[PDB]
């Protein structure tokens, strides 16, 4: 969308997941920089009104804020001259029953945004967990329109955001827990028309393939495997539910995106590669035809879950060839990077050395190499497998200084013990079928069960990593860099954290109400530059402190693996909003005040 | 199993030592009910039916409305 | 207790609500001063996890901070050194039933702390809303004993804070609304044993009479009066429980609160004075005697729970006599001023010129002179009525400047219309019998509800008000001071506001995450002076929001007085810590860090 | 009813014109049903039972038990 692309090339704005259809996370406002973080405070703040996880982050367009909740997902948008008046809220009614059928707590990563052309107004795209996708009215709140995308009672949930190419808005879907089919679907954000929707198993009419899919890269698998990599109807409850994050490049004219892991967890009862699931994908926006697909995870034994984020530049190869690349650090602890023309391998790295499931990632057979010493199978326990089911990189969406050509990625240290079970599969019903047991890396103390994060700062053509820290819980909300030297990034243990983008070293942080799961995003406003991040613990690993669970195998395992999360942080609900000495609209006592 | 030899091309998946290579009628037969099976595509069917009506409305009144229902 | 009042006199504490014995709110601390409040600012924050009302204050004491929450009640202790990680937490297990029998909301107003002598800790005394008192080791967190002194099935609920004194504690008690007759009870703080029990109305027995009770002025009423005053058994469920405050006078050896208000809330069903609720009591700690008791409301007609704050001065009347005093605001619209040895009324003024309920307060017989016009009966519509049942003071809890003699009181501005019904008396129900309908008063914009409180700075013996202000809201949660001329507050649309003492000049604000309803408390902490506050709206003003009601006579006609309310603010709750240019624990990102 | 004349010390309450001085058997009789009116005063003599035995037992064994049913 060409006023899209506009509108983010200015500072005082944050129109959609990701600031950029690079997704690159990052800000050439050098006001706060390494110089003077060490004054970074609380400008203002805003108390959502709802417990649970936080994940996203705000949008600023307009000079309005446009705020998103958990369950029931409620919308708010404040004036940043008067952010303590609330212009207008929408909140949505929707069936309990919703709750029962969220794998991983009532969260929602995020807003759109779409311009408007003239005869329709701006508008707010949102989901809801229910499954419906609403377009709002920018600047007054009301419904334009509102449609069904998922279907609760078959178990499939809606948690990821919406994203605007041109004139059409992409949802991803949700469900695989529950052994659902995955999907995205294109509607037309004027009228809420469906354009196209392409599946991830199946007949290849259903997974809506170009005519010359993967033409450069025969060797990923082409036709036929939608089906062929099964056994018998498998597929139609196979998973491959696509929830992370999207990246764009107009010129390609693709959407980049990851699908997820297949169901069920229990490696045995889904004999074969299990296309199309755990696949890097390139479709036509307008279209949704696939030019290239890369299988990342072939046949997942561990919920490798492949949506990860996908992040663009243009650099160099080995080879000194300028390339247009897409970099994607994977849940199965491996960082691919491809070309986003054809879909090439260019580079296949570890998040870290413990990772120990593959042994590597063949370049020139794009298979990763397994060590079957730690797969799974029925009647059998696995132990000490590195990533976890959680992996070591989950939601979070990173960012990229393009003048560094590095990547400041939020890494999971979490490894796990795995057994199987058979069950049947009732459509509504969890259709898991494992029982996991969590722990921190090698690298993390494993008897006080801490030092489950790590934050790294990488390049994608040497593989190198410029620098690596520790955290004392998984870094799992991504992160978010500016020109002025300094990388931001919330905690679960409830800070807001500040490193020297060169060196790493922790240069400043501030301790908000709750853990934070989402991503820190900045815009300017009047000439300040504010520094803004949700904070309400939740998600996947917040999941027993949410649900009040002691059992360390509830939580699909994740209770076990932050066990100690609750002496650090509690749940919680909000906007914390940061500006150099906490300069505000506030700064003059009288404004907002009643006359 | 290590992945690396594949019957074709996009296709390397190999039984692990004393495991079937079709798990039908073995041990680890799935037995999925076909009936189960084909929930989810006519879920979507049906809502893909809602939504067309919605949206046909919408474009025809000009005003959106929800309920099916309602909808003449 | 000496050791208390020795306590209270360090800057670095604050060991019971009220701050001190006299519960004045004032401190000494000038580090943060009207020379640079404008550099006030967030230096770390904590989200209790839970929603609703958050009432009261925390207490810090020997470096460690310990915060309350709403329902369930739960208690958490921080170190001041590194406030990230929770020293040891309390979550109660409560009967979910408790929820439906409590008239505003599931709050609390606070802990109380016990020194320790030897063989026994330090001790953090708390309340549940279920009705049990328990006693935590303050170090530990542990039980070390837990007693009922409300039962829920009769609609006896607990919100009230405890009282330490000497070596015993002061638990009150609520349910007016629900026919609860009221008794506050002094139990041993080592052993958890009642010592004495004392009722508000009915046999002199229950009263719990000094032989020499209302000596001094035997025209308040002395024996008898606590059936006299009503007809039949009527007293039995004639309410008059306190949920208030307390203060104390070692020199006295009494404790000083009001009873409230009698039930139900149809004026026509109890025909008599109801002695002795809306009364100001004068108790020996000890013993439990009451050694004075002045009615401010008799046959009260209009829910004027007389529970207010009471604050301890000594000042020279008018006859320039040095006096012992008690100043008490209360919800009738009247300031209360009493000599604190024997009960004489030294003045009792309007706390705005637009109470029309009475139309003075006759100081020599100590009757206040009732206007007809406004007062309420069976088959009648009485109309704008001031105060409203919320009063034009309620829970909040103000403060004094020993050195200006000023009291900085937090005022309501909210008239009502009022119209009682039949209705029988079911252990168990609400037994309101009433149906009201707020709104601003004459000073406020009746038109677009807002104008609903107001701030004023009062002299006891002059009667005059240095000065006057207009808030937004009701200011709820009541006020501090400290001798850097300042004033500290929070406001309901979820403001910290500072005003300048002398001229009431609005210095400076800040936006927290939500509206504040409980009292600002300061404290040092390495030589840096810091001032706290919790955050989360709710309390009876906040009733419509907090359980989504539209009906403007619902929440006791609460509801359509504050239906602006949720444009401003959302539920939240947690702690706000500020401090001069945010300094704070994690100045040096390191501290805190796992290494 | 204005409040300033009274029967006695303490006791000035007066009925509003046009109603009884007395609302037993009129129009405005609650009729309240003394099994009722004493279902609050039975309730604390039994916690005041229980705390009893609850504190006793703390100060004999030096163990705090809440459950009653424990005590011996
Ligand atoms: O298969 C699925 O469709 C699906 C959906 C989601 C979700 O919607 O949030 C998660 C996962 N899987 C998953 O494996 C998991 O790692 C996860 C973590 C989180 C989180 O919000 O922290 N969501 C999800
Ligand atoms: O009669 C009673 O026992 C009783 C109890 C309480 C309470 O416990 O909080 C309130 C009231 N009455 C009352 O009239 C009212 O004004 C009120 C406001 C609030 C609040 O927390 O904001 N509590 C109470
Ligand atoms: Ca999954
Ligand atoms: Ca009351």
């Excluded at chain 1, 949008?59 to 804020?65: P, T």
């Excluded at chain 1, 949700?174 to 954000?189: H, I, K, N, P, Q």
């Excluded at chain 1, 939601?395 to 490894?415: T, V």
């Excluded at chain 1, 990034?489 to 983008?501: H, I, P």
Aim: hydrophobic share 35%; with cysteine; aromatic share 12%.
């Amino acid at each position: 969308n060409d006023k899209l692309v506009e509108l983010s090339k200015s500072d005082d704005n944050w129109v959609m997941p990701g600031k950029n259809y690079d997704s690159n996370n990052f800000s050439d406002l050098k006001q706060i920089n390494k110089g003077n973080v060490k004054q970074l405070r609380p400008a203002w703040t805003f108390s959502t009104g709802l417990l649970n996880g936080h994940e996203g982050a705000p949008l600023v367009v307009d000079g309005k804020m446009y705020i998103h909740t958990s369950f029931p997902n409620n919308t708010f948008a404040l004036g940043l001259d008067d952010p303590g008046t609330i212009l207008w809220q929408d909140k949505p009614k929707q069936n309990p029953a919703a709750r029962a059928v969220a794998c991983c707590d009532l969260v929602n990563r995020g807003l759109a945004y779409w311009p408007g052309d003239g005869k329709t107004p701006a508008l707010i795209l949102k989901t809801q967990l229910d499954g419906n996708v609403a377009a709002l009215n920018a600047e007054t709140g009301e419904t334009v329109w509102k449609v069904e995308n998922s279907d609760i009672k078959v178990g499939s949930t809606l948690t990821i955001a919406p994203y605007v190419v041109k004139d059409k808005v992409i949802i991803g879907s949700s469900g695989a827990e529950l052994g659902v089919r995955g999907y995205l679907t294109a509607y037309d954000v004027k009228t809420g028309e469906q354009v196209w929707r392409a599946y991830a198993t199946g007949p290849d009419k259903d997974l809506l393939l170009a005519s010359d899919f993967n033409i450069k890269n025969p060797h990923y698998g082409q036709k036929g495997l939608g089906t062929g990599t099964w056994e018998g109807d498998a597929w139609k409850i196979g998973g491959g539910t696509n929830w992370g994050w999207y990246a764009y490049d107009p010129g390609t004219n693709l959407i980049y995106f990851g699908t997820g892991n297949p169901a069920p967890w229990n490696e045995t009862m889904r004999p074969g590669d299990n296309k199309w699931t755990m696949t890097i994908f390139g479709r036509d926006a307008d279209t949704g035809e696939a030019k290239f697909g890369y299988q990342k995870t072939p046949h997942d034994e561990w919920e490798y879950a492949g949506v990860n984020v996908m992040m663009l530049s243009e650099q160099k190869d080995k080879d000194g060839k300028a390339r247009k690349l897409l970099t994607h650090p994977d849940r199965n602890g491996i960082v691919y990077t491809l070309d986003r023309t054809d879909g090439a391998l260019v580079s296949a790295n570890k998040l870290d050395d413990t990772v120990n499931v593959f042994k590597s990632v063949d370049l020139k057979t794009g298979q990763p190499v397994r060590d079957p010493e730690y797969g799974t199978r029925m009647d059998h326990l696995a132990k000490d497998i590195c990533p976890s089911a959680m992996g070591y990189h989950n939601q979070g969406h990173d960012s990229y200084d393009p003048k560094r050509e590095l990547f400041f990625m939020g890494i999971n240290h979490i490894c796990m013990d795995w057994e199987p079970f058979m069950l049947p599969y009732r459509a509504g019903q969890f259709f898991v079928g494992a029982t996991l047991n969590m722990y921190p890396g090698p690298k993390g103390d494993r008897q006080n069960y801490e030092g489950l994060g790590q934050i790294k700062a990488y390049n994608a053509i040497t593989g190198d990593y410029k620098w690596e820290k520790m955290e004392r819980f998984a870094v799992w909300g991504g992160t978010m860099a500016t020109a002025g030297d300094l990388v931001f990034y919330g905690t679960l243990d409830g800070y807001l954290k500040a490193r020297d983008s060169d060196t790493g070293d922790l240069l400043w942080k501030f301790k908000i109400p709750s853990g934070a799961i989402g991503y820190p995003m900045t815009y300017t406003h009047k000439g300040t530059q504010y520094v803004a991040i949700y904070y309400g613990v939740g998600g996947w690993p917040g999941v027993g402190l949410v649900f009040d669970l002691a059992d360390p195998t509830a939580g699909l395992g994740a209770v076990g693996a932050f066990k100690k999360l609750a002496n650090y942080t509690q749940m919680g609900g909000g906007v914390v909003v940061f500006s150099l000495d906490g300069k505000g609209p506030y700064d003059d006592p009288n404004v907002g005040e009643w006359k | 199993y290590d992945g690396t030899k594949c019957k074709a091309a996009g296709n390397c998946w190999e039984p692990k030592p004393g495991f079937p290579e079709k798990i039908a009628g073995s041990k680890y037969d799935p037995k999925h009910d076909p009936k189960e099976l084909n929930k989810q595509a006519d879920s979507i069917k049906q809502m893909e039916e809602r939504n067309k009506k919605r949206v046909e409305n919408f474009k025809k009144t000009g005003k959106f409305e929800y309920d099916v229902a309602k909808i003449s």
